[PDB]
Design a protein around this nucleic acid. Structure first.
Ligand code: MG
Ligand code: MG
Ligand code: MG
Ligand code: MG
Ligand code: MG
Ligand code: MG
Ligand code: MG
Ligand code: MG
Ligand code: MG
Ligand code: MG
Ligand code: MG
Ligand code: MG
Ligand code: MG
Ligand code: MG
Ligand code: MG
Ligand code: MG
Lengths: 51, 177, 76, 117, 136, 68
RNA sequence: ACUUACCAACCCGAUGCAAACUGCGAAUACCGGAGAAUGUUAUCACGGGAGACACACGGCGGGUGCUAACGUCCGUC
RNA sequence: UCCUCCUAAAGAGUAACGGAGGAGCACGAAGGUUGGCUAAUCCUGGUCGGACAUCAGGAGGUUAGUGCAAUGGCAUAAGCCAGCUUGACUGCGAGCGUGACGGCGCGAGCAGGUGCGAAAGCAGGUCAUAGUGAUCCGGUGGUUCUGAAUGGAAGGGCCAUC
RNA sequence: UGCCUGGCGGCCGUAGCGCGGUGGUCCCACCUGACCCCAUGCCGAACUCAGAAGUGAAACGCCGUAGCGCCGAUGGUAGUGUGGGGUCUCCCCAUGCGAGAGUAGGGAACUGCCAGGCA
């Protein structure tokens, strides 16, 4: 409900992604969060993208 | 600091012999002086508050805390958390230097001054008073004032009664009736 | 305007009573708030379910200055 | 909230958490003039070892009883006393004081001397 | 005419009316009118009876009403199917159990209160009896 | 008292008028110095309004009548 | 700004009322441990075959209805 | 369709075109952790200020507050700030609860890697309970799978997701 | 061994509030000072540090004291399991369980480990 689904993508080469939502209006910039990439088995920066 | 001494060097003595207290720790003490400016209309002009704080800042000598509305209430059309005033709590050296500047060179610059009330005590020894014009303080540069503005003073005390509370202030020859 | 609605019963309540012997993990109470609080060898989950952290016998007690209800598990 | 009742309130949570864990706690108490330490058993009602600046054996060697240097001596003492009684692993109960002045000097000293926490 | 000024809920389950009365002594006046049957007093009944006892004494002395109709009663009208929702509140009753002191009175002679309580008694749907204040 | 956010605060000296009892005080005001290295500023102080200064008024405040 | 036969929430003492009130609170019910007698295993599992899913009056506890109905909807016997 | 209270007979469950209400969202902080804090309401005093803003004292004691309905909870706060943050982790999971089933839920503990803390320790979202849509078909990315003579490819499976 | 204090607990109002009295060698508290450690959406108030001039005023502890809270029978009353009955919306009998409120009355906690001070 106005809250859009986005995917956070692994900054390593893997194509691993977490999925979440965003109020794309009030918080229009790209969400960037450290999370665990299970393919390299290490925590890596993840950066917002479209779904 | 001079007036802290007059408290120690001179006031205690006066009060002990006045009320015949058994322990010197019963003698009323000035605990703190809290300055407040009820702004009320920054809700319309966000900038009216900034100039009030800086008025207090030069008056008190420390950065004021700006007080938010504890509670939204539509009577004054204010939403909770709206900045609606600013305050300063003075203690120690700074409180005493203010206490002096107040009597020695502000109250005299009140327009047609004739003395302060002696009945503005809250009933448990604390005295509160208003000023209409912050221009009585010489830290205020009459040319720069954006606007004349007033001010709450409360002297919180450790007297249990007003009779005791008044003697403490009286003992500084605090101007009354 | 108009009534006629309700929701499913959540089948809450005490699941093992005083004395019942349980293996660790067994839910002892389903509750909304903490009517019973977790005591020794008892865990509290996010919906305030109290569960066993050890094999033993269920023990209800009342403890403390607020007279709160506590569940613990005694080894048997 | 009145200094004392406020500190105790600040302390209650960590102690219940500690009770649940069954830790033997190294409990510190601070006062402007003195500092005190008790190693207390998990039941909460029997003290296994103790040291403080209130015992003459300790204060004799101290400039002023209420400062950081003295607290460091108390820390060193409980640690030693506890190890002679076979005690090694404990948990620290700062008891509502900040972990910081004197209190932090005392812990460091118990740690300097082999007490495990 | 008595009625709750406001209530938490509009309507109330029918419920039942077993039990003995509470508030069984003349606790305000000198004399009382006491319930012997179980049942319902309507707000209008309390009134028909209140007027009469007050007529009867020529508005002398003092009167207390110990009951209050806080129970909403509904009814379904003519030409209505069962169901389709609970009836509408039409009137209010107080539930009466044997022993309830209904009215008290004082400031008048024993003889006159009895006449007055007798006159009201004719307005009520439950048997009553005449009582007096008692030490202990 | 919190580093790096307050208003200077010096020990200023205050000069009065037809009376030679300056005072020195905290205050934040700005002026220009002298004796042992302070401030200055000529007002009309406590020992001046005629309910502090008790009587003697005259001065350059105001009057109450002339003659008679 | 003073005052009135007026009307007055709060608070105090006195008295009722509550399914969606509780600073109290049973009888029964239910869950669990042990134990004997008794009981054609009455219990449990899997497996073959089903039927049945219009219910009725009475009793107790109730909602609804008028504490109306050979009324109507639940629980229990 | 879903949540909360009552009916509901002191375990669970329990009907009605019975009685009240509410959801189909929200939040990168309003999540995590460490440290810290304690409401509402009245009286008295106080510039402009008023029945009610901000300041002070006393009384009070949670009647406040909780992103929102109700109930249940909450001071050790779950209520209010601040700093550092990404555990709003990936793989699993003893043992339970609840369901005709499909499913739903609670869950210590193990592995890997992580945040906060001196530390004991906490964290697998939010005080809990609503905030939702099976299958098919199909889109997108990944892939030691499969690849109709053979090597590829297309299609398919597998993981993620729309 | 005793009285006093402090710290950690058991119990969780018979344990609390009040009202009165009371103690400072030690403890404890207010306290003194603060550049600094460290802190204040401002304030050395609180946090915190260095201290020991003063005080038991506040607070705290102890003693008392029934104004409250709190506790609380006996008897009776309510209800209710089974069986039976009536004038069956409610009631009664036998038997078992047996409240709540209220009354008498209790009540100014009791207690463990450790440590210090006096005797
Ligand atoms: Mg079968
Ligand atoms: Mg059918
Ligand atoms: Mg059927
Ligand atoms: Mg049927
Ligand atoms: Mg029928
Ligand atoms: Mg039930
Ligand atoms: Mg039941
Ligand atoms: Mg905390
Ligand atoms: Mg006011
Ligand atoms: Mg670390
Ligand atoms: Mg929250
Ligand atoms: Mg081919
Ligand atoms: Mg091929
Ligand atoms: Mg201090
Ligand atoms: Mg005292
Ligand atoms: Mg009783």
């Amino acid at each position: 409900g106005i809250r859009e689904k986005i995917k956070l993508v692994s900054s390593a080469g893997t194509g691993h992604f977490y999925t979440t939502t965003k109020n794309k209006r009030t918080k229009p910039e790209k969400l960037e969060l450290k999370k665990f990439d299970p393919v390299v088995r290490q925590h890596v920066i993840y950066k917002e993208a479209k779904a | 600091a001079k007036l802290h001494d007059y408290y120690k060097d001179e006031v205690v003595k006066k009060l002990m012999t006045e009320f015949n207290y058994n322990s010197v720790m019963q003698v009323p003490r000035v605990e703190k002086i809290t300055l407040n400016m009820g702004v009320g209309e920054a809700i319309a002009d966000k900038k009216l508050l900034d100039n009030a704080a800086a008025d207090l800042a030069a008056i008190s000598g420390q950065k004021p805390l700006i007080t938010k509305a504890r509670k939204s209430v539509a009577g004054f059309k204010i939403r909770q958390g709206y900045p609606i005033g600013c305050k300063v709590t003075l203690r120690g050296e700074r409180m005493w230097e203010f206490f002096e500047r107040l009597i020695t060179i502000a109250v005299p610059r009140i327009r047609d001054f004739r003395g302060l009330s002696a009945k503005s005590f809250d009933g448990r020894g604390n005295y509160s008073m208003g000023v209409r014009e912050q221009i009585i303080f010489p830290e205020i540069d009459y040319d720069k004032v954006d606007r004349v503005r007033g001010l709450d003073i409360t002297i919180t005390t450790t007297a249990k009664s007003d009779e005791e509370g008044r003697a403490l202030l009286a003992a500084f020859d605090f101007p009354f009736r | 305007t108009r009534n006629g609605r309700d929701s499913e019963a959540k089948r809450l309540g005490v699941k093992r009573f005083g004395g019942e012997s349980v293996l660790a993990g067994s839910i002892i109470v389903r509750q909304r708030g903490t009517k019973f609080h977790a005591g020794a060898n008892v865990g509290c989950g996010r919906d305030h379910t109290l569960f066993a952290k050890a094999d033993g016998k269920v023990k209800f007690e009342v403890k403390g200055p607020k007279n709160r209800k506590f569940i613990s598990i005694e080894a048997e | 909230m009145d200094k004392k009742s406020a500190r105790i309130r600040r302390a209650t949570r960590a102690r219940r958490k500690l009770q649940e864990l069954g830790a033997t706690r190294l409990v510190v108490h601070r006062t402007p003039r003195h500092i005190y330490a008790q190693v207390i058993a998990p039941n909460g009602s029997e003290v296994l070892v103790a040291a403080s600046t209130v015992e003459k054996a300790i204060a004799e060697q101290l400039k002023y009883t209420g400062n950081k240097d003295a607290a460091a001596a108390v820390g060193k003492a409980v640690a030693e006393r506890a190890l002679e009684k076979g005690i090694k692993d404990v948990s620290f109960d700062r008891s509502g004081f900040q972990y910081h002045g004197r209190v932090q000097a005392l812990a460091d000293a118990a740690r300097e001397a082999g007490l495990q926490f | 005419m008595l009625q709750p000024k406001r209530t938490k809920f509009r309507k109330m389950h029918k419920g039942r009316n077993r039990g003995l009365a509470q508030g069984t002594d003349v606790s305000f006046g000198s004399f009382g009118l006491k319930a012997v049957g179980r049942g319902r007093l309507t707000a209008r009944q309390i009134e028909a009876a209140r007027r009469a006892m007050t007529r009867a004494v020529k508005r002398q002395g003092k009167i207390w009403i110990r009951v209050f109709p806080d129970k909403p009663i509904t009814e379904k009208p003519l030409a209505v199917r069962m169901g389709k929702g609970k009836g509408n509140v039409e009137y209010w009753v107080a539930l009466i159990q044997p022993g309830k002191v209904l009215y008290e009175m004082d400031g008048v002679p024993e003889e006159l209160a009895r006449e007055a309580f007798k006159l009201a008694a004719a307005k009520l749907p439950i048997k009553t009896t005449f009582v007096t204040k008692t030490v202990m | 008292m919190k580093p790096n956010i307050h208003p200077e605060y010096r020990t200023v000296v205050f000069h009065d008028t037809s009376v030679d009892e300056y005072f020195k005080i905290g205050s934040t005001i700005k002026t220009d110095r002298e004796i042992e290295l302070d401030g200055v500023t000529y007002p009309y102080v406590t020992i001046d309004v005629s309910s502090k200064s008790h009587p003697f008024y005259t001065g350059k405040l105001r009057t109450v009548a002339s003659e008679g």
